[PDB]
Amino acid sequence: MSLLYVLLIIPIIGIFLISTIDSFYFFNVSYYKKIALITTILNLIVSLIIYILFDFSNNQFQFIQENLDLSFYDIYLGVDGVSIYFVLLTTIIMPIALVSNWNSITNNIKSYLIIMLLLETLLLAVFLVLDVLLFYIFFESILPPLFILIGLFGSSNKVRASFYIFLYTLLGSLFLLLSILTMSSIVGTTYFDVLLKSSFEYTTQLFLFFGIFIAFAVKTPVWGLNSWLLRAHVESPLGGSIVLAAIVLKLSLYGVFRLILPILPQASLNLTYIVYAIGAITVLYASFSTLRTVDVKELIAYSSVAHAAIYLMGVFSNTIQGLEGAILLGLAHGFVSSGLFICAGGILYDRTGTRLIYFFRGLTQIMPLFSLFFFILCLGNAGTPLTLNFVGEFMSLYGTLERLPIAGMLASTSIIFSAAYSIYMYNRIAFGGSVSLYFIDCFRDLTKREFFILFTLVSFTVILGIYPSFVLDGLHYNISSVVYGIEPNASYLT
Amino acid sequence: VNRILFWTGFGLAVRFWQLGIEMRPFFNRKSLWAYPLFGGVGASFGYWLQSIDEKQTKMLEERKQAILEKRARRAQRQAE
Amino acid sequence: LDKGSIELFGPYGLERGLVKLSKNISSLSTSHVTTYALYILVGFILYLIYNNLLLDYSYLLLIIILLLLLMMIGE
Amino acid sequence: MIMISILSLLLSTSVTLRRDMSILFNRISIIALAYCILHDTMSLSFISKGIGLHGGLLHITNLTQIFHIFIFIISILILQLTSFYPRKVWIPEYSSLKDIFFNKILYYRTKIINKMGEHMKIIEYPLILLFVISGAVFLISTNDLVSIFLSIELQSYGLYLLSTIYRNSELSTTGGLIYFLLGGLSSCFILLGTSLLYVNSGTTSLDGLYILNSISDVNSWYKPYYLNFSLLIFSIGFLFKVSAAPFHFWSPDVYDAIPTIVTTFVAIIAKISIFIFLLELVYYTNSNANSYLSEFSWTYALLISSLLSLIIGTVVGLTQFRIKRLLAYSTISHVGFILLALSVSSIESTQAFIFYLIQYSISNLNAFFILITIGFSLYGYVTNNKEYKSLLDKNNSPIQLISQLKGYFYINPLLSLSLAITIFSFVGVPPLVGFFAKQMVLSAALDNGYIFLSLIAIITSVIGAVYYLNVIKEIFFYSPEHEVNPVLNESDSNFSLRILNEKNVLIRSVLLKGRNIFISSPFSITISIITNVILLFIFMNKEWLSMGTILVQILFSA
Amino acid sequence: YHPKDAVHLGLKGAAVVGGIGLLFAAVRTSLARKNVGPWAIFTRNGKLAATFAAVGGAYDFTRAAAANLREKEDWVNNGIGGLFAGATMGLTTGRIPRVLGFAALTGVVLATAEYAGSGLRGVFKRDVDEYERKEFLRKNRRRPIEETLAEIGEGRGIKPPGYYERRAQRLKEKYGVDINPVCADPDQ
Amino acid sequence: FLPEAMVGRSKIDEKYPDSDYPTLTDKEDPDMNGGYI
Amino acid sequence: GLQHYKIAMDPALVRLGSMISNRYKYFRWTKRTALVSFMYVVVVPSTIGYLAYKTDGLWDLRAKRRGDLISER
Amino acid sequence: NITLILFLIGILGFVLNRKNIILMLISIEIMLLSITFLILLSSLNMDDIIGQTYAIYIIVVAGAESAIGLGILVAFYRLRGSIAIEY
Ligand SMILES: CCCCCCCCCCCCO[C@@H]1O[C@H](CO)[C@@H](O[C@H]2O[C@H](CO)[C@@H](O)[C@H](O)[C@H]2O)[C@H](O)[C@H]1O
Ligand SMILES: CCCCCCCCCCCCO[C@@H]1O[C@H](CO)[C@@H](O[C@H]2O[C@H](CO)[C@@H](O)[C@H](O)[C@H]2O)[C@H](O)[C@H]1O
Ligand SMILES: CCCCCCCCCCCCO[C@@H]1O[C@H](CO)[C@@H](O[C@H]2O[C@H](CO)[C@@H](O)[C@H](O)[C@H]2O)[C@H](O)[C@H]1O
Ligand SMILES: CCCCCCCCCCCCO[C@@H]1O[C@H](CO)[C@@H](O[C@H]2O[C@H](CO)[C@@H](O)[C@H](O)[C@H]2O)[C@H](O)[C@H]1O
Ligand SMILES: CCCCCCCCCCCCO[C@@H]1O[C@H](CO)[C@@H](O[C@H]2O[C@H](CO)[C@@H](O)[C@H](O)[C@H]2O)[C@H](O)[C@H]1O
Ligand SMILES: CCCCCCCCCCCCO[C@@H]1O[C@H](CO)[C@@H](O[C@H]2O[C@H](CO)[C@@H](O)[C@H](O)[C@H]2O)[C@H](O)[C@H]1O
Incomplete structure (x- = not known):
């Protein structure tokens, strides 16, 4: 069997073991948690084995298994240098997601672990499948377990929040389905190798673009459309919020390198000015309203909207630099947003039971270790050099500017306004007076669990910010096949 | 995937779900014979689906050749 | 906007309108066989009118869309 | 064989008045329907758009037999509901082959198994379904107007009788009355249509009408407007x-x-x-x-x-x-998808039509079994909610409100996920089977120019998903209003079960509480087979979809 | 093209759409629960028939008018008549927001119905071999460079062979400046 | 012919009452916030 | 879930948050709200889009030297 | 032309009926007598015996709906005590 199926089967084996141990024993919930965490370690172990054996400049799909037994819907699993790092991020994030929420679930612990083990399978799949109809199948199988992850383990406004993400993500995904169905009917299949050969007529590509973009604007999400995220990324449990922002948000970032860039190039080129206008607006309106947010977890959720706009504008630049910067900023947001939900929804909400920023002040005086990590995370969210977030923004903004110079200049306002929301939140909670008077008793500082998941996540952000070539070497050759263009003395050689 | 493998497992999955819906214990020793019976029925149904597959393949093959005569022979008569 | 026109012109507007719409339509369903029979004949006449006068398809949608709005309005 | 079954069963139920004798007549109705499946299964060794039989008043088609067998199996699964008692008592002491085959268990089974329940007492219920099935499999194979009329009435009249058979319910008799009075008007319409066909064409044969329509379809005194x-x-x-x-x-x-x-x-x-x-x-x-x-x-x-x-x-x-x-209402939204695939007449729409009908008949069946099993499950539960007290026919429809399903995840977790997997299939979420049905209907419509209807369909699918999620939120997002019966587990409350042997000698006595009462195996196994088909279709799709591709290849062939 | 009498056609919609709504008021009176009488169809439910008449007359007239004004026949006019129909729909409820909301909801449907093609009747048949049409669009993998340039245009990173010499001409015709870049090397 | 509890429009107004959706006017709510003084 | 530490929850601030979370239920269409809802959603993005349309491929700084022109069109 | 008029009478029995579930029983049979009567008069016109036979089988199904219809109406009356529709 292929080694890419081993990534899928392990979480499946782990769900089986959680449901069949109580039959060998009133077993403790501690042993439920250990099995799920070990089984996400193994996926990470395997995924690094896949990465050692990867070939950084091969234009054929790798780790493929020859099926030669065709059906109507067959799983085809290939790994490519444009998808490898999305897989690695998934497998590094899911253990922290489990450890972060280790004592906070308290009830329905089996069901909680079985959903996350299910989620890791489906999100691993969406990066590994070699069809665009297969891509859609897994891109939307994550929807039922997320409706239940929010309504069982979510906060007060959990019911409306779970309806919002499900219904918005269902609606937006059904316009992508109509366009995928058109592509398949014209071409006969949705297997990548046969689609990338095929070139659609301009008018068809103009109508496939309207349909793949409706979906991804719903799933970025852009400003006019993000009302599900400000509910779902907040009412959800801590572990739900980590997966939703780090991994689920990137399903459409990686889905533009497959669905738009190679098969609808003329449409992408001629409509970019519409994308850039939308992207510029969500860099401003989201930045303006991230200043006035009184919910700490909601402030982090709103930050993701402004970040996602920068990478969306990068993936539409037709430049090798904005394309790699978009993947780097997708990865960068993955580690940093994870840490700030760990700070907001998993530490202050553990100790105070509230998310209102009015009750917090001067937390440096009694939690110095929280303050140190909270400040480093806050500076990466502000796009400060030495973090992977700065590199992703620099390259994303450069390509946005080289393609359409006016929108990149309005996108670069982020540099100013991301810094203004990030420092203002940090100053209000850690600094900004003395330990607040609403704290009747003292609050303990970080536990050894809270320290080491923040430390792990922060370490990824810095070392990748110093040596981004750890991720750039795989991207260069594979990214070099989604650029559309020619130069006069370099093309059509004889 | 292998049909005999999928269907054998499908029968083992059907036993696990039935005990879960009944809330009866999975794996009590004096009832473990159910898993072999459910798996054997899953093996047998699948040997029947392999015979179904074999015949359908012949039929779809013939038809794709017939549509390739109708399109051909019509083009032959349009050459006049 | 965020807590306003975006939600009034969207999920909260659609929620408020549709629930009122469906309460009105289900106010038609009265379990009176006498009223059900008239509804079937009414639905029969419209089919005959549609597919015998060769009416413009657009003429139908105007009726259908105009009907939905009257169910949005109460009293 | 369906006709030999009705006459033999009719003669047997005609000379008996015993109501304890109904469970066995329903078991024979399942065995009877199995011989019909062996006969139609063996009648599938030919290619033809059709063979007119019995003087041309009937026809046989590959699509006709497949549907005859699908009808017989859907019938055998519903029949199980009246052929096996709702609950069973199971102990690991009586669970092996030697026990279930050569040993026996004796206890007071009447109140545990609801032996004298209403659905276990009608004796003609297995017979009435068999007369409905007969009209259905005749309608499939009708080649003449009169045959259509006589078949639709055979099926319609038996549906009215099934809807009035709970004679002591004010609700059931009301429903049968509404069904007959609105159904009779529907039959006038079917009769008016056929009459105006024969009166203008001189023929009652469908093939003659098809040829009169075939000759007219060319791009003066007799326009064929009547068809x-x-x-x-x-x-x-x-x-x-x-x-x-x-x-x-x-x-x-x-x-x-x-x-x-x-x-x-x-x-x-x-x-x-x-x-x-x-x-x-x-x-x-x-x-x-x-x-x-x-x-x-x-x-x-x-x-x-x-x-x-x-x-x-x-x-x-x-x-x-x-x-x-x-x-x-959910079924009405599913016939809006079945009806679009039928209206676009293309090779892709017919294959998508055939898939949608079979899989939806299979999944809505699971939605009905899960509901009936949840009703039987609350026998060991009690509730104090004031609204449930005032419900009507609490025995004929145990679950009536969506609020009676609050916190069922707490009572039975996998039964709740079976109802989740089935409802998410109605929504059309992948990888579930009901996705692959709406995918095919939308692709058929888009490929042939029905873009406007497709956009309407995906819009309403969002709207219809709202009331499906309300059911899911109600079963999982809340805590139950149903508590275990306190008497069933009282420590002093136990029922004695005796294990005998072949020559009726005690092997063991056992003390059992309400914790030893479960759902019966026919219901649990049927639910798990269909929930698994919905969840695992992406790994087992070749034979089901290929059957449809071959079937539409013949209907459109030549 | 052949001009059409807008006023005539506009009345036809009023009678066609209004005629149906008159049948709806007939249902309302027949199902009245009191002894309201036959003439109640024109007194109690008259506003039901009037709004159908108003909407029908606005649509067909305004569309036929817009057809004459633009001297074209296409999906666009089914839009203009649609907006003026929903505009009349909201005039009854007396709320300004509903006037815009109904018009948006009404007009977007009618344009979408027409541009997508007439679905509710027989869809137009091209009467051509579908196997040839589908197979051509699957194996039409390369195109003449000139064909793509028309839709996207040379520039924006699409620099086809000879772009610089053409750009020289384009700039000379517009700015009026001869292009002569500096050697940037002191020898040769 | 059916009981009012089952088809009646009333229990929809009890299960989905119109009061779920505020409709305060310019007098009782100028800030559009809920009557927040 | 877990019991948190004691917080002097402020009756005033709790209802302020409860005001914000429920705020959208009371939004109305007035002449004031339409004006803001029209400028932010339509005018400002339409204005940005127009500049994005008119300057597309207008300028390139790549390799351009003295004697050459930044304008590409 | 008599056949169509008598069809209208059955239709109009459904138009004027708010309370008579018995007249709904009656008008269905007036509608059946129209359609059978139309089939018969066209059979005389075409010298066909199949139209006569099709009438016979309509008459036999028509009587059977009366038995099922009056039987179900009896089952309803036993628990109701009234055939009336409150309105
Ligand atoms: C497509 C469908 C939707 C996709 C998402 C699927 C989500 C599946 C969730 C996991 C399956 C159900 O998870 C199930 O939860 C119930 C809750 O009563 C647990 O059941 C147990 O809960 C607690 C645990 O301490 C016990 O005290 C209790 O006695 C027992 O009922 C089961 O041990 C667990 O397996
Ligand atoms: C482009 C437009 C957007 C596309 C589609 C977006 C649709 C999202 C709208 C869903 C509306 C919310 O859906 C509905 O919300 C209410 C709460 O408000 C929920 O109601 C629930 O929460 C309330 C909170 O007091 C509780 O009484 C209870 O837990 C429950 O009734 C319903 O269970 C849900 O049906
Ligand atoms: C950035 C733009 C995002 C767009 C997101 C998608 C928009 C979806 C389109 C339809 C949205 C619903 O649109 C909304 O309709 C409902 C009725 O259903 C209206 O809701 C309300 O209308 C009027 C006020 O105008 C009220 O008196 C009435 O009681 C109520 O129904 C809203 O005024 C309208 O804005
Ligand atoms: C969960 C779903 C699992 C799959 C369920 C469906 C599996 C069964 C599908 C069988 C039908 C298609 O498969 C095939 O069809 C054709 C046409 O009808 C038939 O084929 C038959 O006719 C030909 C023609 O003379 C005979 O020579 C042949 O021996 C005979 O089998 C059979 O029926 C079956 O061989
Ligand atoms: C384009 C498709 C997408 C848009 C579709 C929108 C459809 C929305 C349907 C909403 C269905 C009902 O959704 C919800 O139902 C619950 C039922 O208690 C109610 O919810 C209510 O709960 C409490 C009482 O319990 C109320 O005080 C509160 O005002 C409200 O949240 C409301 O009636 C509605 O918020
Ligand atoms: C960081 C992103 C940077 C790229 C985006 C901004 C690029 C701006 C480039 C501006 C210069 C482009 O090229 C420039 O065109 C302008 C057009 O008015 C000319 O500007 C000149 O135009 C007229 C003649 O028409 C002169 O009389 C006038 O004094 C001056 O405005 C310059 O002579 C030419 O050099």
């Missing part, structure tokens, strides 16, 4: 029988009033026969040549019905609080 006008009246009656809007107000009321056992059968079987019959009629009334004939195509009524059924079925269901009324 499209006759078939539009004709389809109005069949639209009512399948409850497509606008003629749908009857189904929510009848499906909620009659007992849930009964609504499994009545809400499935009539659509399977009516929709298969219409497909052959749509194929041979097609206008290949764009002429004035295609402007009055009768298929437009199905296009307007499908459009209206998509809207009505998904909008009106938002405010339902009764589960059976909810499921009635």
